[PDB]
UniProtKB/Swiss-Prot annotation, chain D:
Function: Core subunit of the mitochondrial membrane respiratory chain NADH dehydrogenase (Complex I) which catalyzes electron transfer from NADH through the respiratory chain, using ubiquinone as an electron acceptor. Essential for the catalytic activity and assembly of complex I.
GO molecular function: NADH dehydrogenase (ubiquinone) activity
Keyword tags: Electron transport, Membrane, Mitochondrion, Mitochondrion inner membrane, NAD, Respiratory chain, Translocase, Transmembrane, Transmembrane helix, Transport, Ubiquinone
The keyword GTP-binding is assigned to this record: no
Residues of the full protein shown: 1 to 331 of 606
GO cellular component, one term: mitochondrial inner membrane
Record's protein name: NADH-ubiquinone oxidoreductase chain 5
EC number: 7.1.1.2
GO annotation terms (biological process): electron transport coupled proton transport; mitochondrial electron transport, NADH to ubiquinone; mitochondrial respiratory chain complex I assembly
Membrane-spanning intervals of the chain: 4-24, 43-63, 84-104, 114-134, 140-160, 171-191, 213-233, 241-261, 272-292, 301-320
Protein's membrane topology: Multi-pass membrane protein
Subcellular location: Mitochondrion inner membrane
Enzymatic reactions: a ubiquinone + NADH + 5 H(+)(in) = a ubiquinol + NAD(+) + 4 H(+)(out)
Subunit structure and binding partners: Core subunit of respiratory chain NADH dehydrogenase (Complex I) which is composed of 45 different subunits.
From Swiss-Prot, chain G:
Keyword Cell cycle listed: no
A Pfam short name: Proton_antipo_M
Subcellular location: Mitochondrion inner membrane
Keyword Oxidoreductase recorded: no
Designated name of the protein: NADH-ubiquinone oxidoreductase chain 4
Family (UniProt): Belongs to the complex I subunit 4 family.
Record-level GO BP terms: electron transport coupled proton transport; mitochondrial electron transport, NADH to ubiquinone; mitochondrial respiratory chain complex I assembly
GO cellular component: mitochondrial inner membrane; respiratory chain complex I
Segments crossing the lipid bilayer: 22-42, 60-80, 98-118, 147-167, 196-216, 224-244, 256-276, 284-303, 308-330, 351-371, 391-411
Catalytic activity: a ubiquinone + NADH + 5 H(+)(in) = a ubiquinol + NAD(+) + 4 H(+)(out)
Amino acid sequence: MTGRQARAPLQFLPDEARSLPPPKLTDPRLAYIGFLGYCSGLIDNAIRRRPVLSAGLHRQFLYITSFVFVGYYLLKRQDYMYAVRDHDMFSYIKSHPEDFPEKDKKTYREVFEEFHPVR
Amino acid sequence: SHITKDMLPGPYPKTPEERAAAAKKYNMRVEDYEPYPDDGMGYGDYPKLPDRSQQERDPWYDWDHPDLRLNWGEPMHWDLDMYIRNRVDTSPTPVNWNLMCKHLFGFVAFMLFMFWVGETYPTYQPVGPKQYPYNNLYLERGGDPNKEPEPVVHYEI
Amino acid sequence: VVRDHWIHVLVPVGFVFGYYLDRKNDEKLAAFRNKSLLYKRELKPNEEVTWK
Amino acid sequence: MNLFSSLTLVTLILLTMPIAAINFNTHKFTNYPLYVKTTISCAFITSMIPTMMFIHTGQEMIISNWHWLTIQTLKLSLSFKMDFFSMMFVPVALFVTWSIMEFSMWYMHSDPNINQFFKYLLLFLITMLILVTANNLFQLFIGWEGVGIMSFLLIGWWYGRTDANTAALQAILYNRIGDIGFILAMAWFLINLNTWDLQQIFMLNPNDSNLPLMGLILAATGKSAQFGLHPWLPSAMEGPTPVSALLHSSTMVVAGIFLLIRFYPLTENNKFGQSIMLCLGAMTTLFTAMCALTQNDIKKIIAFSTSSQLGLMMVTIGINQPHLAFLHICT
Amino acid sequence: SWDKDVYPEPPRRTPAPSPQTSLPNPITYLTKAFDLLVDRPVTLVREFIERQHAKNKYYYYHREFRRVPDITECHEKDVLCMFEAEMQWKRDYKVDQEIVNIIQERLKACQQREGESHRQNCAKELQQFTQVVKAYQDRYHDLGAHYSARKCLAKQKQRMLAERKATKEAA
Amino acid sequence: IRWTCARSANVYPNFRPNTKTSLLGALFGIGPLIFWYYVFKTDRDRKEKLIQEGKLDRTFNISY
Amino acid sequence: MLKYIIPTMMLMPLTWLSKNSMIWINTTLHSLLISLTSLLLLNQFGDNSLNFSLTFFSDSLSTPLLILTMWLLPLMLMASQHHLSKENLARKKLFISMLILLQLFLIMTFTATELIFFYIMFEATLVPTLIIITRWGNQTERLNAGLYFLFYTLAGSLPLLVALIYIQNTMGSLNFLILQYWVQPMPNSWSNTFMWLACMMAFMVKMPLYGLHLWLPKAHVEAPIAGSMVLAAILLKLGGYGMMRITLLLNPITDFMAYPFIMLSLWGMIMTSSICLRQTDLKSLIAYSSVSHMALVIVAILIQTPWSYMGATALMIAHGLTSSMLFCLANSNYERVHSRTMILARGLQTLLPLMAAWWLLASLTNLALPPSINLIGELFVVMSTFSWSNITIILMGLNMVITALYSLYMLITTQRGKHTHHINNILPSFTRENALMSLHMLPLLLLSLNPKIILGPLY
Amino acid sequence: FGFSIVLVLGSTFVAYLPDYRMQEWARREAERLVKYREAHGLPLMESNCFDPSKIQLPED
């Protein structure tokens, strides 16, 4: 789905991204990114012949911090994009209400179907 | 270990070297080795045997595998799993085989024929039917307590 | 006293943590509390709940 | 009566203690044969009473409990009925097998695997009892395959001896032919009469009695060593001696025609079926008679004799006379 | 505890004994010895258990239901309507299964009481069994395994439409 | 070991597709299949047309 | 259920940060604790299934299979020693962690909300078993077996994804609840026939049916014991579970197009029972036994009676337990002699006396032990198929006869008749094998007592 | 931790628990409803499980 008002260049975090609730502490996706950072540092120590689970503790801390930071900004952009998709959808509903009629919601007392007996 | 030359790739041509290596690997006399031959039914180049081997191999030879009839070195039969005692008795019959099957089928046909002759010719005795008292057990047969009572009675003879 | 084996303690802690998270998920999905049409009553008898 | 039902249920339950007793032993027994002998004698002194109370009274009753799968319009419980033949047939089997306990004390006196032998033999008796008491036909099927596989084990008691396991394989194969006949009867009963329960079966007797009767004929020839399905009987005589005595004296040999006795209002009709009954039994009788001459193995001789007696009982089922056939079972 | 007006039984036609014997009667001596050596231990143990039940009281309660409206009053999608209607329908299905179970149990009891007089005293009960099973064979049977309720409703509409066509042709 | 390895793994070589082997294969694999398929055709058409007539033995036929 | 997923994530680093001679007891103990924890599962009642979250919901089809999976894990985790005791500690940790990850994707697979999640966890189930059998196959064609396995299961299971996205964008969301409420008959077009053939053919390949079962013998003769039991029990009965869930939609055309699968299933069941009657290599006999029983399962699925579904799930659970037990018996024989064949190791009534009890009991459970769950399943399937057709009982009973036959021959070939008196290296019967057999067969008899659990949602 | 605390405890857990499919509940419900319908004279299991007056059949 194309921009949609690139006037207003690429703008990694836009102005209206502060007009929506940001994600919070212990949300599961950033926790997944944090475990991904722990596994990143652990496997970094596993590349070279330095021992695993030791002697890379600042690398553990730096990789986990960096991934949580990056993933937090990515989550903010993600929720912005879904919100603007929602607003564009409902605004096109408002622009052409006539093209989308309410379907004939019959109750099942008057609905005829087929039966197709299995035996 | 296990050398690759103890498997069996390739068939029986050509006749010097294949029969030579078959006598090597199969521990057999050269003319005693026989290919099948190959007919697209797999089989490699596996030996053909005299194919009975279990009611043969008389028990007093006292070989090494007593309930297998092996010798620890044999061409084992390709269809050995059907041959063993407890599976198929390939004995020499006391009489024949064709005489056996023909007289058994003739006996079966005779007995069933006389059964059908009996089924058209029953026994019966100088006895009439049973004169049940109440409309042949009506209300103790199928019922109908108010549908159909019927007048029918026996007369004394 | 706990440091003799800190290994065997781990999986009941994991189970209790998952159970607490499932109860928090059920609190997040706490709609249609008395709005159902068959299992319906008021905020009664004690205090203002029908499941928690 | 609480007395009557209680005594029948304890004739069932007193053949449950010794198996779990030696499985809970973790010691070394000596007089476990004496223990099994005295508990079979106890079973007989319990089971002598309800037959006397029966012919004194009547009161022909059914018991049923511990239901499971009340799923669709049926439910099946552990359910058995004490009636005329199913009640007076128990003490005969108990007393006969008590004699076989004595004869097995003598016969297998010098072979120290006697404990596993008596466990198999007792479990075979229990399975045969659960067969002959039941009206819920799934319990009949339980006892049916159970006495088939205990027959397998008792024939193949002597491991080694290719005769034995050959024989046992033949016996179990012909009993699976009995099984396909019995499950065909079971399937017809379920689909047409909502259950396999002889109360409802004999309450609603249909006139189409052809497919279940053919299933009954196939179960009968699978069990009772009939023409074409006989030769596992001398093969079965290749087992040990009181094994063969119990296996083809009372138990396991009359159970095929026992079911046909049990279905007598179902086989009041369909004279085509009774014609097939008597013709088949006559075929068995004369075939094993002509085979029975010129044979020199005494076990096989008595096997041919009892095959002929089973043929006379098949004739006795063919004519509408089931109670003479049951009296022939006992004698 | 069971309602005899929903579990019917004929009363106890108890014949009086009549000897005409001088052996006399081993079974009477046996049943009096049975009562003396069996019933009183059973009575003592059951009375102790009955007092220990009489200590305090527990109470199991029948879960009671309303009537959520209908499946035919739900629309074509109505997701918070169909769920209520069809679980109520499933409970109707299972309780109707147990109706059929109860009637078939009564048939078995009528068979066993009368002995061999099957054509006596089992008339109304056989007839109501045939009635309920004709309703069941016509209503729930030939539809399949993934019923929800709507297959049964389609069967219902097609059944009454076939009968409407039948009476329209036969009138 | 030689008999086992010849019996299991040394079948697929050596193979050639002969016309007699192929016709015998297509007869021993497809013959009984189309035989039982024809008889299921037969029995199912008879039973379904019979219950479409409505003259089944469904006096009570619950356990389907 | 999330409280069943998250201790499995906690069970993985247990294996890592436990030390030498300390990983084993901790993993075994704690996975048995998880077996208790999901023995606590069965809250399911009445009208619906037990349904908790956008994430999770569990039927009583999924309930016994999930309990069976978590019960089969620690038994297996004890079963897979004696062939990696001499291997490395790190490679041992990799093995055990791969098993735990495989269990995790099994539970993920059984409690899927939408069928897309079911497919993702389906091929997630597919992937590590490959690594298990290829890294510890212990025979020269584990190459070919893993290659056949992955290619058949992908390339049969590949159009299933396309058909699921098509059902996604034609009928709204793919959750099983609303699809249970928004089904509608899709009549005899040809695209309906292709779509039905896609979904059913993918799960056909997973069962396997007779048409392409050829990966299954190599995948059991050329696999270690852990991957073999996981493969057979949980993967084949998972395929059956998946067909049970997807078959709710597409009702109107199955009368048109369900005939030939029934045909291939029945005739291939008979031919499979024929081909296992004669073969050597004892380990393969259980595999062809599995092919026969799952052909019976497939017949039970494609006929559509609640009797048939209850018998189907009974046969699922019963053959899972029986085949896993019998695999471990074959593994015990392969630990005794290094043969894998059938005619070499003979005797064994003298030697190992109570091992005979377990062989007898296993051949009884293959033999349809008369109150066992196996007989319940086979019996109700025969009932429903005799309702479906009055002539198919011939093939069912012929299957019954040959089933009894090959089970009995599997018994008496190995443990009857003569000890070969030249082997002389068997150790006596370990407590490990008897412990594993008591872990197998006591639950089977307990479920034989009160089988109202193991009957499915159409109870 | 496989037998003494798993096997027998799971055995006593599955030996009795609240009934699947509300089974004893269905028993008592069926007893109550059959006593109801036999008290009010009408036959038990009235067929046509939905209201035939409350149906809208599309005619021919």
